[PDB]
Structure formats: C-alpha cells, structure tokens
Amino acid sequence: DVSFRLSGADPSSYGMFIKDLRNALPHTEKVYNIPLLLPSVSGAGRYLLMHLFNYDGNTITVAVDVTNVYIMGYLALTTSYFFNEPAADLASQYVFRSARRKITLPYSGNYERLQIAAGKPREKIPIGLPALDTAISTLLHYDSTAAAGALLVLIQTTAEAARFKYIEQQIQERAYRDEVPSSATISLENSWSGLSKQIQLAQGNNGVFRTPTVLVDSKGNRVQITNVTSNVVTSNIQLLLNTKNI
Numbered sequence: 128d129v130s131f132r133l134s135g136a137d138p139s140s141y142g143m144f145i146k147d148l149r150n151a152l153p154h155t156e157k158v159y160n161i162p163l164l165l166p167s168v169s170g171a172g173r174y175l176l177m178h179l180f181n182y183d184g185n186t187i188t189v190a191v192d193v194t195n196v197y198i199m200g201y202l203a204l205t206t207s208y209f210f211n212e213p214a215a216d217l218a219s220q221y222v223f224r225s226a227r228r229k230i231t232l233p234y235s236g237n238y239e240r241l242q243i244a245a246g247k248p249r250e251k252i253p254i255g256l257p258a259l260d261t262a263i264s265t266l267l268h269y270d271s272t273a274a275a276g277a278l279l280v281l282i283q284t285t286a287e288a289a290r291f292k293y294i295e296q297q298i299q300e301r302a303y304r305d306e307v308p309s310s311a312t313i314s315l316e317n318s319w320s321g322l323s324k325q326i327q328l329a330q331g332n333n334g335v336f337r338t339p340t341v342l343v344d345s346k347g348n349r350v351q352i353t354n355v356t357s358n359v360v361t362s363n364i365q366l367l368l369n370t371k372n373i
C-alpha cells in the first residue's frame with residue numbers, strides 16, 4: 128500500500144507519494160526507459176490500496192488497478208463505493224470485503240461520465256493539494272453529485288500525476304492554492320492511451336510513431352508528437368499502458 132497525508136503536506140511530501148505510487152505498480156519491462164505496465168494481473172494482486180488522509184486525519188482507502196492506474200472504488204469508514212462498470216464490479220470481489228455495506232456509484236469512472244454527473248468539465252474544476260483535501264472530505268460522506276467532482280480531483284492528483292511528471296509538477300505548484308488544470312494537463316490526460324501505444328509501436332519502427340499524437344503545450348500551442356526524441360517521451364511520461372489493453 129501507499130499513503131499520503133494532507134496534514135503538513137508540501138511539494139516534497141507530495142512528490143514522495145507520487146514516487147511511492149509509481150513504484151507500487153509492477154512491471155517486467157521498460158520501453159524507451161519508461162516502465163511498461165503489465166498486460167494483466169490475476170486476483171487481489173491486481174489492486175493497489177492508497178491510504179489518503181485529509182488535513183484532520185480522516186482517511187479513505189482508494190483501490191487502483193495496477194495494470195492501468197484506474198481507480199476502481201474506495202472505502203470510507205465502513206462503506207465501500209465502486210464505479211458502475213464491470214472492472215470495478217470485479218474489483219469489489221477482492222477489495223474492501225469487510226465493509227458493512229457496498230454502494231455502487233451511479234456512474235462509471237471515465238471522464239465523460241464523471242463530468243456529466245458533476246455538472247461541469249474538468250477544465251472548470253480547480254485542482255491542487257487543497258482540492259485533494261476537499262475531495263477526501265467529500266468522499267467520506269455519500270453524495271453522488273459532489274463525489275463526481277471529488278473523484279475528478281482525486282484521479283488527476285493521483286493517477287494522472289503518477290503517469291506524467293508535468294502533471295505532478297502542476298499539482299506541486301498548487302500545493303497551497305488550487306487552480307484549474309492547464310490545457311496541456313488536459314491534453315496529456317486525454318492522450319495517455321495514444322502515447323502509450325505509439326511509444327510501444329515505435330519499438331520496431333526506429334523510434335518513429337506509426338501515427339502522430341497531437342498535444343497542447345505549456346503556452347497553449349497545439350504540437351504534433353512524431354517520435355521518441357520528444358520531451359514528452361524522454362522526460363514527462365512515467366508509465367505506459369500496455370498495448371494489450373488498448
């Protein structure tokens with residue numbers, strides 16, 4: 128398991144958490160020096176538990192699928208909550224079994240459905256360590272509309288930061304003040320599957336992408352990524368979704 132405490136949190140301790148999170152995801156291979164997530168893992172070993180504590184020391188435990196860094200559900204006090212999708216339903220067979228009751232959330236975990244449930248796109252939802260503190264607090268007490276927004280915050284400040292150093296740094300910049308994600312952040316989140324695939328396809332193609340990936344950079348400019356020499360590949364992305372899962 129990995130842990131993060133918002134009480135006394137700073138960019139350093141958050142950085143240590145994102146490092147622990149990355150290091151808890153198993154891999155047997157690196158592709159262009161980036162860890163390649165496994166095609167599959169059977170049984171309970173598929174799920175990592177993240178223990179998150181809000182500023183007051185209250186805690187939720189979040190279950191993460193280690194093959195794709197997708198959040199499946201979470202435990203708050205004696206109640207478990209899972210996304211309304213088959214992967215989460217499967218996860219509920221292995222994690223938080225000791226919960227007194229299990230609630231299935233009225234949405235799946237993808238961004239489109241969460242944004243619908245939350246009533247806003249995540250372009251308009253501030254993120255940062257204070258927002259994560261809030262998200263944790265919100266998830267302690269069931270409110271499915273509030274939870275959708277909290278989960279958008281949670282996903283981005285955890286999984287997405289694990290996947291991209293740029294996003295980790297974005298959150299570190301928001302250690303004491305929330306701010307909506309940069310469009311570069313949104314772009315990277317939306318492109319993780321695509322990038323993961325093209326980096327793998329580049330292996331037998333002299334480092335060249337079979338299909339270019341379009342991203343928005345830090346200045347808001349739309350750029351094409353065509354090969355593994357790009358800074359997105361050499362410096363930014365930290366985890367690859369296995370093509371077997373794409």
Ligand SMILES: O=c1ccn([C@@H]2O[C@H](COP(=O)(O)OP(=O)(O)O)[C@@H](O)[C@H]2O)c(=O)[nH]1
Nearest residue numbers: 196197198199210235236237238239282286
């Ligand atoms: O369109 C999206 C938006 C978000 N996520 C991921 O959602 C995860 C948690 O959701 P879940 O795995 O339950 O949903 P699924 O993506 O399997 O539909 C996060 O780590 C995000 O990467 C996603 O897979 N697809």
Ligand SMILES: *[C@@H]1O[C@H](CO)[C@@H](O)[C@H](O)[C@H]1NC(C)=O
Nearest residue numbers: 335352353354355356357358
């Ligand atoms: C590869 O990408 C780099 C970095 O963006 C770019 O400068 C170069 O033109 C590309 N080279 C090839 C062979 O595609």
